[PDB]
Symmetry: C4
Subunit: 406 residues, 4 copies
């Protein structure tokens, strides 16, 4: 038994051309065939008529944080138990999945949220996207991802390497191995200061070359990719030269960093949305903590500008929003931002399909609508190439050959 889909229009992920009237055949969780025109459907077990829709391969977001959504000081709850993070993550994942993103890379949570959610989803306990998690983001004492920042002296215990806070190359290995132990698919580190952390710096280098080299060599031994938070150029370059797979945000990326990324084939995940988010919010008094506000006003506005520079220079780019800052499910806005800043619509869609698939090392199974690959497809009314914002209304989502939406 097989499923036949009549696609009015088709963006396959590889071809720079929007193809008209195509037949996609699904067998199990695989795309078994692709024929031109609308072939007869009377002989197929199931038929999905999307002649009035534009079909695309499942979309991917390389930077999400299911389990959290940034709230102002006035709105933020007093505390958030781990159980609450997990509970909220189920909903965050579902709305993201329903909006068209069938695969996501969670690069940071308290530790076991995305890992547990991924396992529950993969074993059919609930619906959601394919999740590739990094578990606890690794940082150095006081770093952007140190979970004990913003706490009075007697209100916290100094973190140990296994908890994601390290100093030196040996503690780095302990931390990387701990993520492997927790069940993570990859590694995430904050190579420079950050914005939303209750800490002084928003961009200083927080990993020594020896420490970030240790991250790469350790992750390589465990077959783990390495995503890297970085705003300041210096920390960013220590990571690019070390051989990490991707730089997130890269706010103050300079000319040298750009050529280094091109030479090493490093992926750039802009998260323009999150950038615009903190900018806008930085104008509201007491929205952010006082120590955070300055950083948000500085970093946020520069991402859109850095994005254009990186794109024109030829830096590899993969789709990433940093959803968990802004509300989950608004991932599509990232496309509109990428376009307004110089990237043509089709190139933008390819950055969330094939480019993301390569960064996650799964391009041979997902990322495009081609015979043999896994059946992850979405559909929407309208032409994304003429107005990519139409992607806000994805109304059909198929994952692993199964239809959830539509």
């Amino acid at each position: 038994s097989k499923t036949l889909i009549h696609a009015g229009k088709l963006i396959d992920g590889k071809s720079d051309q929007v193809q008209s009237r195509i037949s996609i055949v699904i067998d199990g969780n695989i795309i078994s065939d692709i024929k031109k025109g609308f072939i007869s459907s009377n002989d197929f077990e199931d038929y999905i008529d999307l002649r009035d829709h534009t079909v695309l391969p499942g979309l991917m977001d390389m930077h999400v944080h299911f389990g959290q959504e940034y709230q102002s000081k006035a709105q933020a709850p007093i505390k958030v138990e781990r159980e609450m993070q997990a509970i909220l993550a189920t909903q965050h994942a579902y709305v993201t999945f329903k909006s068209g993103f069938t695969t996501v890379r969670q690069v940071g949570d308290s530790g076991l949220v995305a890992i547990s959610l991924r396992d529950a989803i993969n074993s059919g306990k609930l619906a959601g996207p394919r999740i590739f998690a990094a578990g606890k983001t690794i940082a150095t004492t006081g770093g952007h991802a140190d979970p004990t920042n913003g706490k009075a002296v007697d209100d916290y215990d100094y973190p140990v390497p296994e908890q994601g806070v390290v100093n030196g190359p040996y503690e780095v290995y302990a931390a990387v191995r701990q993520r492997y132990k927790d069940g993570a698919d990859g590694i995430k580190i904050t190579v420079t200061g950050g914005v939303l952390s209750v800490a002084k710096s928003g961009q200083n280098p927080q990993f020594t070359q020896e420490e970030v080299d240790a991250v790469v060599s350790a992750a390589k031994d465990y077959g783990m990719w390495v995503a890297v938070h970085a705003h300041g150029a210096e920390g960013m370059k220590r990571a690019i030269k070390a051989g990490v797979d991707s730089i997130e945000h890269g706010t103050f990326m300079d000319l040298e960093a750009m050529d280094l990324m091109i030479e090493n084939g490093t992926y750039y995940v802009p998260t323009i949305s999150a950038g615009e988010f903190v900018a806008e919010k930085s104008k509201i008094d007491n929205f952010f903590p006082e120590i955070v506000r300055p950083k948000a006003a500085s970093v946020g506005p520069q991402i859109s500008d850095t994005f254009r520079k990186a794109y024109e220079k030829g830096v590899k780019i993969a789709f990433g929003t940093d959803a968990g800052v802004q509300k989950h499910g608004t991932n599509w806005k990232e496309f509109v931002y990428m376009v307004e800043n110089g990237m043509p619509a089709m190139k933008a869609i390819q950055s969330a399909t094939m480019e993301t698939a390569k960064l996650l090392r799964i391009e041979d199974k997902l990322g495009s609508i081609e015979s043999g690959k896994l059946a992850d497809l979405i559909a929407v009314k309208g032409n994304p190439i003429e107005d990519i914002s139409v992607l806000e209304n994805v109304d059909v989502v198929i994952k692993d050959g199964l239809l959830y939406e539509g």
Copy 2:
């Protein structure tokens, strides 16, 4: 006073020939003489008539885990106290000893099981084989031998170096020295991922070159041999180049690793039995944990094939079964497996006598029936060279000049 033994046939451990009708004279715990033919016995304090038996030197198993026996999820007890491990070890050791293995190398237990058993046996508290223990196997965070794997976050404390879990060269020394402190004769490490561990990888490199070098240099200072668990080729080679004494399993051993082992004179302990064990069991649903099942199906079947390759290539080989996986006392099956995969029967017996004696650095006192060496002998009805499976019926076991069985 002396003991005279009339051996119908004699496999001495050195000669590639089965000798007929030999007289072995035992004085104390030493083999004092070896004369041809059946000399008069009327003048000896004790006489052991084995004219209808084939005598061999005591057999050796370089890889056993007294104190445990792998059981399915359905059969496995909820918990196993240290006292229970020790209690069960007494029986495991005795049945192994009674089957003909007078000397064994225990390469791993919770920490003090084999060490305590060895001391009890050596001081005459109970009967058993000569035991050479490694105590707690050393691993890196999350490694195959990390005793805290498979445990929820709040259900375990991060292990310290002294407990056998390390990161970096200094923690390695602490761990090696701790084994010396506990009373171990040697060291055992998991240089790559493993099968029966509740962990993602079954073969990734888990020791850096610096860390495994530290293992060798540290063990050398304490006159300790180094046994190494290794399935993946990369971790395996880091260990071979570091100078370890033996590689256990070596499932995905490649051409380069083989020449390295030959050049460094490293011993290969196949444990084909354990390999075949996990393969067969991997076909039974819910026998192994879900995370373990895939690894067992992959690794297990390849050992028999790797064994043949290693043997023909000329890699040194010493007898080892990994009994503790399969039931203790079925050690003999390893011989049948070695033969079916290309090794002639006599060479197989020599690998459990003289080859094992060299790996344990005791070839000048055990390993062959020669004048001067310790009186460790076994006997069996039948010719092992024509059907080595006959070794399942060893009916005479002499250790240190004393008769236990027969």
Copy 3:
């Protein structure tokens, strides 16, 4: 609206000349203009008539310890809670501020005293000088700044790196990063033994070259300056060669150390006052602990002599008293000491204005009475150039364009 000040005499911080009759115009927290003669005041919102005073820019002390004041064994309280240190610090800061010091560099306290005081002052909770803090001084086990010295075995827990006691380069980074985490502006370490610490040595090298190099490289990544306690020449040179910003005390500074400081552009903060303090007190029986007394008698008298040598040799010098030893508010005496030991009065005043501003990296905003810079000014009756001790009677203090005293 603006404020007009008629200054009888003016020492601006840059010019080696005392200028007569000058008009300074303050707009907000900025010095908007400087005109010659006494311009009309009828048109200014506010007028400050100081025609009978000598105006100078706000003074700076590069070495203070608000929160403590050394007391004899007989006078010292049994214990001092952290809350008491903070409470006393508010007063210590205010009297120092009222004496003319508008900016100070606190280089050491239990950890969060100066940091908390600085934040309270900067947010307008109370009056005080501009504070730049180093938080907890970093030391090696048993070092001059180890807060657990002088305690019986069962009366203390071995300190961890985050508490300011380190060993090796990795623990150094943890300690430097912890100060960044606590909110410090800079770093302070004891590179050699000290006087007031209950420890055997008063000058031995307590940081290895590798450890102090780690301090500099770590602090550089966080944009933190590095102040260094040092009496012995060897520890001092390890720090000078490492690239620290300033050497405090430098009691046994040798010819080589002097040229090194000149070559690297390192600042010398003498603290002659504190030196003379421990000398005088060392003559009183039981004033200092018995283990401290010898060190105080040795180190204290040499500072005045070393100061002259350093000055004539051309070593850069910035004003620093080590107030917290002697009473707070007597900072002015340091000027008289600098003069009596060879430094001309004007050069002394410049060392507490522009030289201090450069060491704190704020010379572009403070340190001199020049158009554009921040409005930090003081006034006194008399000519400081003819008798610098007149600075004991500063009667006008303006900070950030606001008048507190006068």
Copy 4:
């Protein structure tokens, strides 16, 4: 006021000749003059008539353990509180002092015994010799001086560097600095296994070259001498090459180690007495623990032989007994042992006066009866050069110009 002493015979520590009829004048704690013949005494405040005695300078023992005395398993108390060690140390020190040893180097105790005793004596709380302590002997995990050896798993906590058990160069520094913190004058380490420790090895190398180098460089920064326990040649050489001040025992010292010690000017402290002690006792069943007995039988007998070899080869030698093994107060027997093994009597006495003074870096103040040096003198009836065993009857002991015995 001064004291006059008429010495029948005089061994001054420098001259290889026994001088006849000499007058020694004591002024305060100093030897103010030395005249030939017996000058008039009617004009001196005090007179000490020793015309019938042989006077020598105060004797020194470079290796003592006040606070302990090795007892058989049958005699040993169940436990020894720290308070008991200290209490017993007062007596051990006094009897040693009364036997003629005015200065001793304690190289090991639970931690604060010798340090506390030294301070009590130096401040006049009680009588005893001048003590130079090393505090807690530093060792690596399981090493000869690991205070947690011989304890069941749940009966001890893994020691930290500050407690004297280390791994790696950084932990070494923490341990050396901790001894400085406790108040030690020097450092003592066990570079190889030992005899009286409940551990497997009695001579294996237990410090890596990097670790022992760290001991020297760390101790040098604190002006501390380094004494080294060593039986095995390999560990011994790592220490000699590192630059330690003395090797204790040096049981299996080889030709290479001897030339190295000569080239580096390292002192050899034989402790022949302790050697002979464990030998004799090793013949008594159950005197030593079973794990210790073998080591004692092996090491003990070789010291006397190694001593002769070292002496003839020209290796520097300083007097040391390891009293604390054998009873305290029997220190004199070491002289008789040194003589019987090839060292002439006078050379033996010089090894406990000037040679010891050089090793303790106090040869400019003690070690010989010369004008200007401190007044530490002893007397005995008889000629030590003809029968050094006469030193068992020292009946006059003067320390710091004060008479205690006689």
